[PDB]
Design a binder for this molecule. Structure first.
Ligand code: CDL
Ligand code: UQ9
Ligand code: PC1
Ligand code: PC1
Ligand code: 3PE
Ligand code: 3PE
Ligand code: 3PE
Ligand code: UQ1
Ligand code: SF4
Ligand code: SF4
Lengths: 93, 174, 27, 386, 96, 67, 79, 156, 316
């Protein structure tokens, strides 16, 4: 609730400003696979981040060995994905 | 005589030196130092209304027609100021004044047409038309910029004291 | 006309003596 | 139309007015067809209707960053047709203000280049130095720019009593100001990238497309019309042309910073060795009589009246005289009948040739690259459009 | 070092007569500095020149209210300076 | 000189400390002079709630050995 | 090796990049503390330790946990 | 309380805001552009007066037409003038744009920009001195100060 | 009370947001040998309020365009930026969130839309080309921006920004992890589209979503950018430069937070004047080639440093 209170004031402050703006002064084919490709890579990386996001809680896991063994494998396999992105003209705009 | 502006071993010392330049952005930091340095220098700007950028005597500025100390306007309508104006700005038509002397009935400098060359200042034999010091004559309407004999003569009377000083300083040179 | 400390900050940051070639022209 | 997109006339990036109808596959430029004439004004036809001395002010306006150097080209041309040459002091003056003008152009070209690139502090640093130079112009001619000081028979009026000393104080210091810009751009880890290996022009191609300027010199061709075909007293001075290798935006830049440096070497000399003498030819036939003389001697009034009202009356002939204006070879082909007003005056603009090269330079390049290349050609639309 | 500037800064501020002078001068010019008064022209105007300041700012004119009855205190204009004193201000002649 | 960029900053700084001092005293006023309990995990909310029930309705009121 | 050298001076990020990748893949294997992490975190008591019935003959700390028997974290102390 | 007073004061505020911050969109046709870059430069700082170095055709309060407005560029000038906000102004700079200037009789030069865009302040001089432009920008500021839009609303 | 604590934490920031533009138009000035704006008001203090009033009064021209993806875009930009100051932990925060940094990362990510929506809404070529490139580097930079934080968190133990005040009671996280600070600082420069990385407002390049935006819409993003400029700098001043915290007096934390935030806010002002703008591909070349391999590897080093140095951070 406390957050809700703050946020609605936040929207109100902005909606107030746009309105004032309008009310006070009364007196086609841009495409480059590179751009699409980036967006994609971005999510593959964003989804990877999502897998890495639990690592702060997983640090405290009793296993530890498996934690790191897992995390290191994830980071390494994605980075190799990047590596091949390099070989491919990908990442070369 | 010529010179090569950009005409050009790998040692750890060298490489480590080069790698540090890329890794910790050493040259970029060099550039920041230069701007921080000036931040501490005195700014060169002038309060425009209160302090004015210096203009020496030959500054052409705004046209004026001078008069003899007695009070007789200097122009005798020879009309070569019209002949040498590059832009066709000055229009002069004349007729003998009753005195019998020769004077201009109409002298119109179109300042919007004028490109302030200063040849008219040069050409006049009696030096009646001069490039006056004032540069601040911006006007709300286009018509005000067109100037007839009365505005220029009035401009001449207002700035005669400084015009005389300016011509006094630069006539030996001419 | 600037305190030597502030002036120094200038020379140091610049790497050469601006005092010798100033931006303020004088008599 | 491969998303044809007018660079647009109103664009801070486009000096003055340039419609570059560009077809870009996304962010890559496939073809650049620059449009010109947004500043055509008739300078070449207007001159035919004006006398030689009243056409001198047009030349200052042809490329006004380089106000005077342009005037020297017409001067020289009119002097050749008359077979008259200016007095010794006037020659040195023209080289003195010829060089000061080169600096002024390079400060414009290097700093305006950066503003489009995105570096804005170099412009303010050097526009203050520019300002100080303008003041020289004003105290010599009367106008900050568009002086009309260099006339067809020498300069108009001797230097004020004291200018030389100040063109010294300034010169004595300007170097540090160029040095600073350097510590900001010559080695910036980022200036290099956006400039290096952009718009490389071969040596053979540069001569073929008539580049004739730093653009040639940057590709390693050694040609400075000031050393190859000396004009005025640029022969008596000693300077080093800054030739370049691996010609590209960065290399040519370095060349323009180096001529700023070399021009200070030429200015120094001119101050050290300018002769006592007159500043205009003594032929009342070509140069207007001194005002004390026209007000006391009949032959001088007649010569003053005829010169201002009618004109030089140049002997019939035609000449192409080219100097080394800061942009490149500026030449006037002045055909002349025996009349006091010229017949033709094609102005060769270093810039009509350079723009044409934009197409052969910016190929397979991004939108930002086009902005960098227009800067490395110092395009002043006045000279191109004339 | 800093001691002097703090001290001399006070001089400028306390130099303009009463509080009002400062507040006035502060508002219309936005620059506070003290200089010898070269002259006061008949149209209300006051001119000061300081040798120490750089060439651009060593000569300044503090404009006065109603120099032709125009309420010029806020809307000050350059042309207000009289033709006689115009060249002194622009450094055309180094003689006041 | 550069003396003048300070005025503006002063009004920025003063407007960036207010918030940190304000939020950190409108907490020590509403919570009875004791920092607002941060209930990251339930245990803490439990203890906090338990406190409410223990006295008045507000947790900040804190009963002691004398109860 | 030679490329390595230039690589150290040209494209000197990847070199550093990989180097770290490895150093993080080694230090854990060889270190006098790696073992502690699984212990220090194991020890941290989050969930209540439920007591077992004393059928008898057990080494479990009876009564006060302070009894000398049982696990200790003096390894954690003075670590 | 008389609304009339209340109105004047309000108008003034409005005028002070527009007159203190004029964001100029400059064209730089020709050379008088070089004399404006000088204004933007350190001797005569335009910013100090609230004039921004430069802005796009939209966010711009005043358009300074510097340089010859040739017949080909004449359709554009208009477009950009027409693409600016409701409170907009034009400061013609240069004899080449006040009237026709050295190129008045040419076939490719419009004899003045006030034939294509309404002009509020005309700054004279072939390279109108930068101080003169500054004088001209300051006179636009006095022109705005005098404008009384809400009092006419009230009295209308 | 809580409402009062919403005025404070908002207004104060908005007033400070206004004074940043002024300290930008003067610090850039003195660096370029010019006084900057001092004539309106005393020393230019009234200058920010003046153009705000001019901007709102000028016509908000609606192009011959969407009318919502046009008005939603500035509202979203101001709303997210002012919102992200809600959880910031100056001394003690307004709304303490257990997963606070994920809130800041998520809220930042949403601002990329405003750029996308404004670019589509304008319906002119300059706007669409600018938006597509702008969206590309923003999310490209988000990928290293996020990984750099994950390295931090793993040495902090939690996502809550409040924990770092207890993590940095003995030393700033710059000493350790400086290599990422730099990479957080450069990424903070990209995400606020400031100079070295500002091809979006690139003027010479695409004069670009703000192109069709004038008056009130211009202002709102505008305000947003500058508030962000502060917020991101403030996050640098909590995550990496940890201001001294004394539980007895909470304001010396905010006093030093004030000092460090202003200096790092001053730094991106100083960066802008000092550097030319990077090329569009030169910008992505940096993140995907130069920084992402550094960040991913240093990310692993920050999962290893804890374990074998038996330093696994205490949750909570
Ligand atoms: C902060 C501590 C004070 C800093 C300071 O005084 O700066 C000048 C002082 C000397 O700098 P400078 O560039 O040599 O000054 C030029 C002249 O020497 C000194 O300039 P001057 O010859 O013009 O001296 C007179 C000047 C003297 O004024 C001062 O020096 C005091 C300024 C205090 C600023 C705080 O008074 C004025 O000109 C009118 C302006 C007065 C101050 C205006 C700004 C006040 C801002 C208030 C809110 C902040 O700076 C320092 O001593 C180091 C400060 C820390 C640097 C990091
Ligand atoms: C072309 O786009 C532009 C730039 O890029 C080159 C600029 O950087 C600049 C330069 C920056 C400026 C002059 C700052 C102008 C912007 C503003 C301050 C807008 C006003 C904002 C505000 C609403 C201030 C906040 C005030 C309040 C509402 C009070 C809070 C309670 C401009 C003007 C520009 O138009
Ligand atoms: C940062 C400095 C800011 C002030 C810069 C101006 C004053 C100093 C000028 C020095 C100069 O001009 O030369 C630069 C010089 C120029 O270097 P160079 O390009 O000549 O190369 C030096 C290396 N060799 C010679 C071997 C090639 O650069 C340096 O001295 C090193 C700079 C390292 C910068 C590392 C990144 C910044 C620091 C990040 C870590 C955090 C620091 C604290 C952050 C804030 C904490 C509150
Ligand atoms: C948030 C948006 C900005 C809110 C207002 C900020 C301050 C504005 C201000 O102080 O105006 C000064 C201006 C000052 O202008 P002025 O016309 O009084 O003149 C002051 C001196 N010069 C000319 C140099 C500016 O106020 C006015 O214009 C006069 C009427 C004020 C009426 C205010 C209440 C309505
Ligand atoms: C264990 C690890 C030990 C350390 C390992 C190395 C860590 C390096 C951390 C920074 C990484 C920088 C980087 O990756 O370089 C990218 C780019 C420089 O690349 P460049 O030199 O052009 O060469 C690239 C091809 N070799 O970076 C650039 O130079 C361009 C950046 C442009 C933006 C402005 C740069 C200057 C910023 C100055 C202020 C920096 C403040 C940093 C600290 C903030 C406060 C904490
Ligand atoms: C976890 C993430 C780790 C890193 C993830 C990213 C990996 C990216 C790998 C890219 C390899 C291909 C490549 O491009 O490298 C070649 C490089 C040229 O770069 P290029 O791409 O062609 O030009 C830029 C435009 N694309 O030019 C080169 O030749 C670079 C060569 C890099 C390898 C040199 C040696 C690196 C490691 C040196 C170790 C030194 C001692 C290490 C001790 C380890 C102890 C355990
Ligand atoms: C405009 C769009 C952006 C809006 C601002 C961005 C808000 C992002 C909010 C993230 C979700 C809320 C959150 O993460 O924490 C809220 C908090 C729960 O977290 P926590 O308290 O730590 O867990 C229990 C232990 N305390 O406690 C709560 O769960 C409070 C309930 C969620 C409040 C979310 C903020 C309000 C969002 C609704 C705004 C309504 C307007 C929507 C406008 C678009 C409509 C389509
Ligand atoms: C060097 O040529 C240039 C001009 O011609 C004089 C300009 O007018 C302009 C426009 C000037 C401003 C102040 C926008 C630019 C940018 C330019 O580069
Ligand atoms: S030249 Fe001098 S005198 Fe002869 S007409 Fe023109 S102005 Fe009058
Ligand atoms: S007016 Fe004089 S200066 Fe301005 S453009 Fe036309 S010619 Fe060049």
């Amino acid at each position: 609730m406390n957050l809700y209170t703050v946020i609605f004031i936040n929207i109100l402050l902005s909606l107030t400003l746009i309105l004032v703006a309008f009310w006070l002064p009364q007196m086609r084919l841009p495409f480059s696979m590179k751009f699409f490709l980036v967006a994609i890579t971005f999510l593959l990386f964003d989804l990877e981040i999502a897998l890495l996001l639990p690592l702060p809680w997983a640090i405290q896991t009793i296993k530890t060995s498996t934690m790191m063994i897992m995390a290191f494998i994830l980071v390494t396999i994605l980075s190799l994905g990047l590596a091949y992105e390099w070989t491919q003209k990908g990442l070369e705009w | 005589t010529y010179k090569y502006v950009n005409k050009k071993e790998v040692d750890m010392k060298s490489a480590t030196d080069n790698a540090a330049r890329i890794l910790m952005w050493t040259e970029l930091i060099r550039g920041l130092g230069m701007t921080l340095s000036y931040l501490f220098r005195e700014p060169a700007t002038i309060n425009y209304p209160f302090e004015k950028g210096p203009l020496s005597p030959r500054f052409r500025g705004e046209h004026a027609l001078r008069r003899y100390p007695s009070g007789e306007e200097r122009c005798i309508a020879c009309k070569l100021c019209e002949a040498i104006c590059p832009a066709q700005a000055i229009t002069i038509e004349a007729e003998p004044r009753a005195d019998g002397s020769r004077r201009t009935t109409r002298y119109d400098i179109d300042m919007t047409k004028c490109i302030y060359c200063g040849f008219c200042q040069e050409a006049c034999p009696v030096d009646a038309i001069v490039e006056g010091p004032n540069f601040e004559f911006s006007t709300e309407t286009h018509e005000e910029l067109l100037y007839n004999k009365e505005k220029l003569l009035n401009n001449g009377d207002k700035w005669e004291a400084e015009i005389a000083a300016n011509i006094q300083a630069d006539y030996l040179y001419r | 006309s600037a305190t030597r400390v502030i002036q120094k900050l200038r020379n140091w940051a610049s790497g050469q003596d601006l005092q010798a070639k100033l931006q303020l022209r004088y008599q | 139309t491969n998303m044809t997109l007018n660079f647009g006339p109103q664009h801070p990036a486009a000096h003055g007015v340039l419609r570059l109808v560009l077809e870009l596959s996304g962010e890559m430029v496939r073809k650049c067809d620059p449009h010109i004439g947004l500043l055509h004004r008739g300078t070449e036809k207007l001159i035919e209707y004006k006398t030689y001395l009243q056409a001198l002010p047009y030349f200052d306006r042809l490329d006004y960053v380089s106000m005077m150097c342009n005037e020297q080209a017409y001067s020289i041309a009119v002097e050749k047709l008359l077979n008259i040459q200016p007095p010794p002091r006037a020659q040195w003056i023209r080289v003195l203000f010829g060089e000061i003008t080169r600096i002024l152009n390079h400060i414009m070209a290097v700093t305006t280049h950066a503003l489009d690139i995105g570096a804005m502090t170099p412009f303010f640093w050097m526009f203050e130095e520019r300002e100080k130079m303008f003041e020289f112009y004003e105290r010599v001619s009367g106008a900050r720019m568009h002086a009309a000081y260099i006339r067809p028979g020498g300069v108009h009026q001797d230097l004020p009593l004291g200018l030389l000393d100040d063109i010294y104080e300034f010169s004595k210091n300007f170097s540090l100001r160029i040095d600073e810009v350097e510590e900001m751009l010559t080695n910036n880890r980022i200036w290099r990238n956006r400039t290096v290996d952009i718009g490389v022009v071969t040596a053979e191609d540069a001569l073929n497309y008539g580049f004739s300027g730093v653009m040639l010199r940057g590709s390693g061709i050694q040609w400075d019309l000031r050393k190859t075909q000396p004009y005025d007293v640029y022969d008596q001075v000693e300077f080093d042309v800054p030739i370049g290798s691996r010609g590209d935006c960065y290399d040519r830049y370095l060349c323009r910073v180096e001529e700023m440096r070399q021009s200070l070497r030429i200015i120094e000399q001119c101050l050290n060795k300018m002769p006592p003498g007159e500043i205009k030819v003594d032929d009342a036939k070509v140069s207007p009589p001194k005002r004390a003389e026209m007000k006391t001697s009949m032959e001088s009034l007649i010569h003053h009246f005829k010169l201002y009202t009618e004109g030089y009356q140049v002997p019939p002939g035609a000449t192409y005289t080219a100097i080394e204006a800061p942009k490149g070879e500026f030449g006037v082909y002045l055909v002349s009948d025996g009349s006091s007003r010229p017949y033709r005056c094609k102005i060769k603009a270093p810039g009509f040739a350079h723009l044409a090269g934009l197409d052969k330079m910016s190929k397979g390049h991004m939108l930002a690259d086009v902005v960098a290349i227009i800067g490395t050609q110092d395009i002043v639309f006045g000279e191109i459009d004339r | 070092e800093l001691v002097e500037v703090l001290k001399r800064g006070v001089q400028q501020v306390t130099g303009h007569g009463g509080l009002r002078g400062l507040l006035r001068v502060f508002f219309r010019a936005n620059d506070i500095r003290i200089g010898t008064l070269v002259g006061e022209d008949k149209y209300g105007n006051k001119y000061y020149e300081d040798n120490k300041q750089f060439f651009g700012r060593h000569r300044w004119v503090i404009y006065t209210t109603e120099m032709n009855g125009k309420n010029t205190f806020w809307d000050v204009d350059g042309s207000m300076v009289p033709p006689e004193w115009h060249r002194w201000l622009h450094c055309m002649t180094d003689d006041p | 000189m550069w003396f003048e960029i300070l005025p503006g900053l002063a009004i920025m700084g003063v407007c960036l400390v207010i918030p940190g001092v304000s939020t950190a005293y409108i907490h020590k006023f509403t919570n009875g002079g004791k920092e607002k309990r941060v209930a990251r995990v339930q245990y803490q909310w439990y203890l906090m709630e338990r406190d409410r029930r223990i006295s008045g309705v507000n947790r900040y009121y804190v009963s002691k050995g004398l109860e | 090796s030679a490329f390595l050298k230039n690589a150290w001076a040209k494209e000197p990020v990847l070199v550093v990049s990989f180097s770290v990748w490895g150093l993080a893949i080694i230090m854990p294997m060889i270190s006098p503390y790696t073992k502690y992490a699984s212990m220090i975190n194991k020890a941290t008591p989050y969930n209540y330790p439920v007591p077992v019935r004393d059928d008898g003959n057990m080494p479990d700390v009876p009564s006060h946990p302070q009894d000398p028997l049982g696990p200790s974290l003096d390894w954690l102390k003075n670590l | 309380s008389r609304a009339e007073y209340v109105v004047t004061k309000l108008d003034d505020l409005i005028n002070w805001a527009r007159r203190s911050s004029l964001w100029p969109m400059t064209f730089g046709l020709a050379c008088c552009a070089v004399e404006m870059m000088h204004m933007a430069a350190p001797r005569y700082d335009m910013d100090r007066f609230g004039v921004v170095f430069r802005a796009s055709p939209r966010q711009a309060d005043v358009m300074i037409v510097a340089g010859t407005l040739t017949n080909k560029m004449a359709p554009a000038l208009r477009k950009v003038y027409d693409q600016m906000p409701e409170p907009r102004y034009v400061v013609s700079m240069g004899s080449c744009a006040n009237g026709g200037g050295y190129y008045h009789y040419s076939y490719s030069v419009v004899r003045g920009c006030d034939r294509i865009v309404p002009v509020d302040i005309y700054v004279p001089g072939c390279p109108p001195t930068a101080e003169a432009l500054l004088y001209g920008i300051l006179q636009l500021q006095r022109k705005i100060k005098r404008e009384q839009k809400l009092k006419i609303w009230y009295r209308r | 009370m809580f409402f009062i604590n919403i005025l404070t934490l908002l207004v104060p920031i908005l007033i400070a947001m206004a004074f940043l533009t002024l300290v930008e138009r003067k610090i850039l000035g003195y660096m370029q040998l010019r006084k900057g704006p001092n004539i309106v008001g005393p020393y230019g203090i009234l200058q920010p309020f003046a153009d705000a009033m001019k901007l709102f009064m000028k016509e908000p021209m609606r192009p011959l365009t969407s009318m919502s993806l046009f008005i939603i875009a500035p509202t979203l930009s101001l709303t997210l930026a002012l919102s992200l100051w809600v959880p910031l932990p100056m001394p003690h925060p307004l709304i303490n969130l257990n997963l606070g940094i994920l809130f800041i990362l998520a809220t930042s990510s949403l601002s990329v839309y405003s750029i996308l929506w404004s670019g589509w809404a304008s319906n002119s070529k300059y706007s669409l080309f600018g938006a597509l490139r702008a969206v590309a580097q923003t999310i490209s930079y988000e990928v290293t921006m996020a990984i750099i934080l994950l390295s931090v968190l793993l040495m902090n133990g939690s996502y809550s920004l409040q924990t770092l005040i207890t993590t940095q009671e003995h030393m700033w996280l710059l000493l350790p992890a400086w290599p990422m600070a730099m990479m957080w600082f450069i990424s903070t420069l990209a995400e606020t589209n400031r100079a070295p990385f500002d091809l979006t407002e690139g003027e010479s390049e695409l004069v670009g979503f703000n192109v069709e935006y004038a008056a009130g819409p211009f202002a709102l993003f505008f305000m947003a950018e500058y508030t962000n400029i502060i917020l991101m700098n403030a996050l640098t001043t909590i995550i990496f430069l940890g201001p001294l915290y004394y539980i007895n007096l909470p304001e010396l934390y905010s006093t030093n937070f004030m000092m460090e935030a202003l200096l790092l806010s001053s730094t991106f002002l100083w960066i802008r004047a000092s550097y030319p703008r990077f090329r569009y591909d030169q910008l992505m070349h940096l993140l995907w080639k130069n920084f992402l391999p550094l960040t991913l590897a240093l990310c692993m080093w920050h999962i290893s440093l804890p374990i074998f140095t038996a330093g696994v951070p205490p949750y909570m």
